[PDB]
Structure formats: structure tokens, C-alpha cells
Amino acid sequence: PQITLWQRPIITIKIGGQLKEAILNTGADDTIFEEMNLPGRWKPKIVGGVGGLVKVREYEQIPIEICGRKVISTVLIGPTPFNIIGRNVMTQLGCTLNF
Amino acid sequence: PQITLWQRPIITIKIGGQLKEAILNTGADDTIFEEMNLPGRWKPKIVGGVGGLVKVREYEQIPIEICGRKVISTVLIGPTPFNIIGRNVMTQLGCTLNF
Ligand SMILES: [Cl-]
Ligand SMILES: [Cl-]
Ligand SMILES: [Cl-]
């Protein structure tokens, strides 16, 4: 699809089988969601996204469906004021900014 | 142009007569640069560049040249860890996200 930027680009996606809102954030290197359960194993990680260092849980191999497309991705769970889809997933999606 | 997201989408732009690096950030409502002296007058504004709430200088009608395109825009000057082109500018350029 083609997402306009008149509004915040917040879409409903299905992440690890659950429906969530998230913003497509080209300023974000990684994908980070607020506390929720994801399937499988995780490892703790320190990241700098995006207001101080934070400890997050990193889950690899997470199925995400976004606007009809399915990817398998690394997702961080921790303190974030918004759920954020970042460039790691956007690259997997083939997403570009076009003008 | 078509900007891919394998790396941070940082571009060199011309803003108020100066060349600056900035990141194309679909997660940012507004366009904010670090301390710079822009042309014209400004008014104080609070914004949630978190950061917590930060006081910024708001400049209106600032010319911006980005990849050969010229726009006249509102720019915030204040604390920000990077110079950010946000959606206000992107919409003026006709930017979309596409996958
Ligand atoms: Cl949600
Ligand atoms: Cl710069
Ligand atoms: Cl204000």
C-alpha cells in the first residue's frame, strides 16, 4: 500500500497473533512495543531508543502481519510511549519513502 | 526520489541558507533542528520531544531545499538529539510510505 502522511501513520497490525496499533516510524532503527506477551524465547538487551537507555526483552522470529504483508521479525518489548514499527521491519516489507 | 531504509534516511538539505544533515522521520509530527540561527522572527512553543516537554523556538515561513525540491515551512529550533524533517515538511513534498 501507499501510506499518506497527513495523519500519523498508525496502522492496526497483528503481532504474535494479537492486534495492536503501531506507528510506522522511519526515524526508529528497531521495532519496540509496550508490554505484551510474544511467543517463544527472549533475551534482555539494552537499547538507546529513544529517551535514555532502556532494558528491553528481545524476541526473534516473530510473525507480524502488516497491511496484508507477512514478515518474520525481531521485536523489542519494553518502555516506549508508542508501539513503533521501525526500519528493521520496514526493510523486510520493502518499504520506501517516495516523493 | 525513492529513499530506502537499510540505513537511517539522513539527507543533506538547505535550510534558511545553511546546509545541514537531517533525518526523514515519519514518527515526528514537526520539523525540529538543533540550535541554528534561522531567518526572521520566532515565537516560543512547548512540544513533547521527549526529552519530556521542551521549550522551542517556532519559526514560520522558512525556506527548505530538499533533493532539488523547494518548500516554505515552519521549523522548530530546540534540543533534539538529531535534526528531524517531520510530517509537516514531508506532506508539502508529497512524501508517502510505499510497500
Ligand atoms: Cl495497541
Ligand atoms: Cl548538520
Ligand atoms: Cl505552546
Numbering used by the authors:
A (entry chain B), B (entry chain A): 1 to 99
Quote the passages of the study that discuss this structure, keeping the authors' original sentences.
The latest International AIDS Society (IAS)-USA panel list shows 11 mutations associated with DRV resistance: V11I, V32I, L33F, I47V, I50V, I54M/L, T74P, L76V, I84V, and L89V. In this study, we generated viruses with high-level resistance to DRV by in vitro selection and determined a crystal structure of an HIV-1 PR with high-level resistance to DRV.
The major virus (referred to as FS5929R1) had two major DRV resistance mutations (I47V and I50V), four minor mutations (V11I, V32I, L33F, and L89V), and V82F. To investigate the mechanism underlying the DRV resistance of FS5929R1, we determined the crystal structure of the ligand-free state of the inactive FS5929R1 PR homodimer at a 1.8 Å resolution. The flap tip that are around the 50th residue curled inward in our crystal structure, whereas the 80s loops were slightly shifted inside of the PR. Interestingly, the regions included the two major DRV resistance mutations (I47V and I50V) and one minor mutation (V32I), which were induced by the in vitro selection. Because the FS5929R1 PR harbored the major mutation I50V, which was absent in the other two PRs, the unique flap conformation is likely attributable to I50V. The curled flap conformations in the FS5929R1 PR might hinder the DRV access to the active site of dimeric PR because the flap tips tended to curl toward the active site. The high mobility of the flaps of the FS5929R1 PR would provide little opportunity for the formation of PI-binding pockets, resulting in reduced opportunity to bind to DRV.
